[PDB]
Amino acid sequence: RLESENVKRLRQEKRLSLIVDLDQTIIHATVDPTVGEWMSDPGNVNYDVLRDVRSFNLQEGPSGYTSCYYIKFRPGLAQFLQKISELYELHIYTMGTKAYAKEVAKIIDPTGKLFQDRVLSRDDSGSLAQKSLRRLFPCDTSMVVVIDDRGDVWDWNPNLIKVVPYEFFVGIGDINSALEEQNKERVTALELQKSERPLAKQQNALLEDEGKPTPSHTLLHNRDHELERLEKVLKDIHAVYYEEENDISSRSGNHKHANVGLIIPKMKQKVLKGCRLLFSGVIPLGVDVLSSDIAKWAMSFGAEVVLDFSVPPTHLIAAKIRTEKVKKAVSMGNIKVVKLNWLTESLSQWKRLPESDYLLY
Ligand code: ALF
Ligand SMILES: [Mg+2]
């Protein structure tokens, strides 16, 4: 009764549901103790961009291994969640532990107003590898949208809006990327990040180089504007859904409704429609091309993927290597040989970029 009732409640509130991933989507976390050092020194070159960083401690594992996690909020997060919460009922669904999720929630939702108890972690999601809409909406996913920096954990679900991974702490990826005892590998990874101090090593390297650009000698920067773009995409999805929902329901007395799983692909398919892609040296010889992540991501944006020249492709995505495919493409004509960057960047910006800026040879 709760589920079906929820759908009715949301449509009455004129809202949709939004599932939010944490790491590299709305925050970036690291346990490199270098952060605490830089934050305690107003004269440090990284001090200013770390002013809004927040931290907390967690004891993980049977041995009670403790770590101080430093969390950076993606630029404009507060306003983003504020505005989007008026259009979407927020959910947190992370691969981090329940304790991790709760600590992050206390910091981005102190009052508990945005998300509430609508937090999902690897402790209760039901899977340590993939995420599923069915864990939250078993029978009806027509109103749930997802924002995550990874498409593979969602099996490139049509309801997903892949976001550009947020990397504030340069060089640090996702700290939450057999079983329990084998997870001694988590302690091992956290320990290694603490001892290597990747941030300090990189900062030292930038300072040791006798280049020229002064600000480029500073490791950390605030240059991200991904949430502004995302806000526009989510507001658009919301409008289209309720616009069609009104027409769809009125014409069928509520028997039929709108479906974000149909709306989102529609929008995406316009970006690379007309493109037929041939990859060269981008996918391992041991990986099925058409089922690879890059292929599914490109295809979700209207791109067609081919395996040869039998039907000459519009683009040749080359690994910056000089191979027979590159040669063959050039000797031919009308192929645009471009770096992988052209594709990933175009896909990330929901806009087909100028091939002119990504040539190889
Ligand atoms: F917070 Al994650 F995949 F980054 F669940
Ligand atoms: Mg993530």
Task: Parse the chain into domains and list their residue ranges.
Answer: 1-162+218-270, 178-217, 271-361
Instruction: Tell me whether residue 35 is exposed, middle or buried, using C-beta atoms within 10 angstroms of its C-beta: 0 to 12, 13 to 18, 19 or more.
Output: buried
Ligand 1: nearest atom to the Cα of 94: 5
Question: Helix or strand or coil: residue 139?
Answer: coil
Residues 220 and 202 sit within 8 Å (Cβ to Cβ): no
44: left (phi over 0), alpha (psi -120 to 50) or beta: beta
Structure tokens that stand for 246 in this block = 């009104």
184 to 122, 178, 180, 188, 191: CA distances (angstroms): 16, 11, 7, 6, 11
Ligand 2 centroid, distance to 317 Cα (angstroms) = 26
Resolution (A): 2.1
CA-proximal residue: ligand 1, atom 1 (nearest)? 22
253 Cβ contact list (under 8 Å, min separation 6): none
- Ligand 1 center to 101 CA (angstroms): 10
Residue 209 φ/ψ region, left for φ over 0, alpha for ψ in the -120 to 50 degree band, beta for the rest: beta
The whole-angstrom separation of Cα 353 and Cα 344 is: 10
Q: Please give the radius of gyration of the chain, using alpha carbons only, rounded to the nearest integer.
A: 23
The CATH architecture annotation of domain 1-162+218-270 reads 3-Layer(aba) Sandwich (3.40)
Q: How far is CA 280 from CA 69, 306, 308, 337, 356, in A?
A: 40, 11, 10, 10, 19
Look-up of token digits 């078993």: 138
Instruction: Tokens for 168, please give them.
Output: 């504030």
Which DSSP category does 58 fall into? Answer: E
Backbone φ and ψ for 316, nearest 5 degrees, come out as -120, 110
Q: Which atom of ligand 1 is nearest to the CA of 122?
A: 5
| 149 Cα–ligand 2 center, Å | 5
Report the catalytic residues: 21, 23
Name the residue with tokens 């006798």. 210
The preferred substitution site among 97, 148, 163, 164 for testing ligand 1, maximizing ligand atoms within 8 Å of CB, is: 148
CATH, domain 271-361, list 1.10.3720.10, 1.10.10.520, 3.40.50.720, 3.40.50.10190: 3.40.50.10190
Residues with CB under 6 A from ligand 1: 21-25, 94-96, 153, 174, 176
- C-alpha distances (whole Å) from 329 to each of 50, 77, 272, 275, 343 are 47, 44, 20, 15, 17
Between CA 31 and CA 193, with CA 53 as vertex, the angle to 5 degrees is: 10
CATH classification code of 178-217: 1.10.287.10
Domain 178-217 and domain 271-361 have a common topology: no
